[PDB]
Symmetry: D2
Subunit: 286 residues, 4 copies
């Protein structure tokens, strides 16, 4: 059964958009030094965007910024920023505008998470997650938005959440709550700031080869109809699409990128997929 999934759901890990389509465009990406943020930056730069990446670890940031800069031939700028601090965010936005200009693409990708029984969390642990995910995305959006309105310019905004932002989930509760907050913000500002030329969309990723929580991966895939984890390149292509001018009428959308995981686990009778064809013949007799 995995031969059908491998042949018909095989990943296409190369650029989807036309060459140089992001030339003249400036992108700002929180968490752009690692994992998903890095892949989005990698693609946007390769397609001609001037990228600006921000997070806490300047060492990883600079290394990644230089690595992509030489790989694509387009300059990637690194700026140190803790998104939960409004003054640092203010500085980062100001520096973004000086070294690159007002952004056409804003990607809120920075996150933190604990996997834990909720009863083992301290108030500070809870607050930490809310600060990075919700308030951090809020501060970045508030400041850039304020500058864009000031400069009579618009932009595409993108927030990366999770499939559990919409459903909730035990064991990742502060994240689930913060991420749900991030989605509500996108929907709110898609409505409010459309008049300013700003649009807001969301990707809800399932487990991507970077999941979280050798035998565990095999178990995870059993809950994924597409029979595999996602890839950073595939996610980047989706992100680039939503941040591109081809999607200029996509606003307030929320797109699952999960190989079908959410629809599988959420469906009441989907546990019946374990039933074999011979067993079904017996049940259909009654």
């Amino acid at each position: 059964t995995e031969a059908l999934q491998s042949k018909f759901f095989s990943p296409l890990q190369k650029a989807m958009l036309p060459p140089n389509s992001f030339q003249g465009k400036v992108a700002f990406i929180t968490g752009g030094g690692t994992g998903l943020g890095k892949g989005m930056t990698t693609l946007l730069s390769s397609l001609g965007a001037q990228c600006v990446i921000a997070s806490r670890k300047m060492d990883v940031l600079k290394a990644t910024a230089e690595q992509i800069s030489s790989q694509t031939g387009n300059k990637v700028h690194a700026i140190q920023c803790d998104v939960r601090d409004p003054d640092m965010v203010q500085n980062t936005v100001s520096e973004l505008i000086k070294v690159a200009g007002h952004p056409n693409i804003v990607i809120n990708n920075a996150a933190g998470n604990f996997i834990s029984p909720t009863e083992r969390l301290s108030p500070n642990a809870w607050k930490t997650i809310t600060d990075i995910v919700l308030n951090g995305t809020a501060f970045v959006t508030l400041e850039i938005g304020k500058q864009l309105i000031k400069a009579q310019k618009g932009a595409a905004f993108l927030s990366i959440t999770t499939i559990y932002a919409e459903t909730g989930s035990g064991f990742v509760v502060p994240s689930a709550s913060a991420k749900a907050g991030v989605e509500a913000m996108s929907k709110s500002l898609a409505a409010e700031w459309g008049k300013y030329g700003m649009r807001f969309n969301v990707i809800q990723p399932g487990p991507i080869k970077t999941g979280a929580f050798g035998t565990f991966e095999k178990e995870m895939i059993g809950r994924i109809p597409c029979g595999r984890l996602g890839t950073v390149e595939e996610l980047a292509n989706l992100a680039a699409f939503l941040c591109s001018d081809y999607a200029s009428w996509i606003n307030g959308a929320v797109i699952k990128f999960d190989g079908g995981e959410e629809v599988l686990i959420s469906g009441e009778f989907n546990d019946l997929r374990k039933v074999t064809k011979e067993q079904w013949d017996t049940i259909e007799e009654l």
Copy 2:
């Protein structure tokens, strides 16, 4: 006519729905219980026999309300001063709750703050203030009560009051929409995670409840967007709350109930603006 039809068939029943003394021996904890919706909920639960404990920042109003309800129902209402955004204040509040009344059977997360403002006019501190009261406050209260319930091998029904815009978003109330959305995801998360400890979690999403008013013309415009043709009442909301926090709803867990007179379905439906089309105009349209 429309007005007389709505008034007759959507008439508010503002009396206790549940059987008298149905909450005897139960203890309820209500954040924001001193005013508005919290007060209405406290008043009903106390009237039905519950021992209530109400918590908020303003001790004077909280004490006044607690004494007012106590005298009306003959059941004690305890006031405790608490800023829910302060985890240490929350810890001491829950500690006092357990000593004065007992472990709660009912926990109502009702305290909130809001600004109506263009988002561009908000400071980071204004945004954070709302997130702090709504999301972190409800989290801190839930976390600490939950910890004490698990320790005590006891369960409880939890209720969070959100808004119809928690699920949809809304411009002009963005910090609130975000924080209230977080509150809903928390309820769904802990309905699942903590069912095994005897805790269940539900949500009511209220539309506008009768509680800038000036001419009264704004209310007239608000009602045009409500199918039921009126604002809701505190007593009706309280009945819904009491039901969800009652043993009759012991199998209701992770539910989200709109209490809005049909407002959300009206405004969200793409072609609902066609309600302003007359019978005559429809005749010509159906003839095209």
Copy 3:
């Protein structure tokens, strides 16, 4: 105490009438599928509370036996009318008889349904169509006809549709049901909006499994409340929604599932079996 004991102690079913004696005096209720299972349960409670109930379904014999049984129990007369809801002519006659024998309904419960549990590939076009007809078209026809008569008479009513938790999420193996049930949900939200000016409000209950081969025990493991629901509990919820206490509840969709949907839908809820001791080891890794 263990999980089971906490669930038993703190989610115990209260299977007696919730609303005050005689609260439905002078109310007429129309309940499709009112002769068996959930429909019979709702009919029993409404009648006991004073309503004049009219039940309608295909099997006149089962319908008559139920109507007699409830009439003798409660003292209040329950009328039985033979109706296949997918037949619009039969629905017309049924509503005409309803108005003649009882009066214009104050409560309309669309409860009749059909369902197959089967791999979708095994379904014939007729098998699919059969489910759509009973569930979606049947609820539509009953709703259209009563609505037309209520508008004519300048009378209002509370409408209630019983769907399922999988109407919102979808689910394999019950696909025609999921589609038809989702349709029934959209209908309620649509008419909640459209027909408020006529004094008609529309709400929905989404039930999980309600108690009536070892799979019963298996379902419970996916229910945070640790048991199946009961008919009496569902009836209480139904009565509340169809009562004047809920006269401002309109367009609501209420899960009645012991937390099943939130449990199965949450990505990390598969970690629920990890014990106190095992969690210490996981936290040691992070």
Copy 4:
């Protein structure tokens, strides 16, 4: 610059092909209602990008004129097959022909629909049933038949249903449509889960109003204009492409923000101007 100027500048439609030239070569696409409007636009893009297209609907004349017109424009052959989707036999015969003239589909688009805008109380039972039959049962029959054939041939495909933003919310005045479309969404999510093992994936686009008087609805669209057929086609093509091979069970709004605008309780405050907001905070 004013609202209309920013909206036009930063939400300008890009109506050219997004995906790489010939990216759909060796792929067969089956589109219901492919002879007109949105179906026509998706067929045109898929054919121009190299796909072998098959279109199916009731009106053979239009279904031949569009197919010939696309064939000559793109150079790639488009086949026309008469099919009323609400009839299982016509569907079965249509699936058999699709496999004969082109082969097993790699792309299935369920786009065919019918609608009335009417107060619900003026609808006959037949009028309701018509919409349910075309939209829900029609999509079901097409999906069931093609699905069955793909399982038998051990072949996979990407499925795409075009619904509406009101499928999720419901809406007065379009009730049979809202219901049937809601059902189509549920079907997609259901089969996304059920048929993963068969290599079949299912997604949904929910469009707002597309430019194919009624222009005051633009005041309810944050992006400040109606959408275009070419923009929708680009989104549709992406979802039906191998670039989207891990996208499954998704529902994408393509509405310029209309749904979030109308559904948000306080969004009716959008006309309040800069000057007016000062006194409110006092």
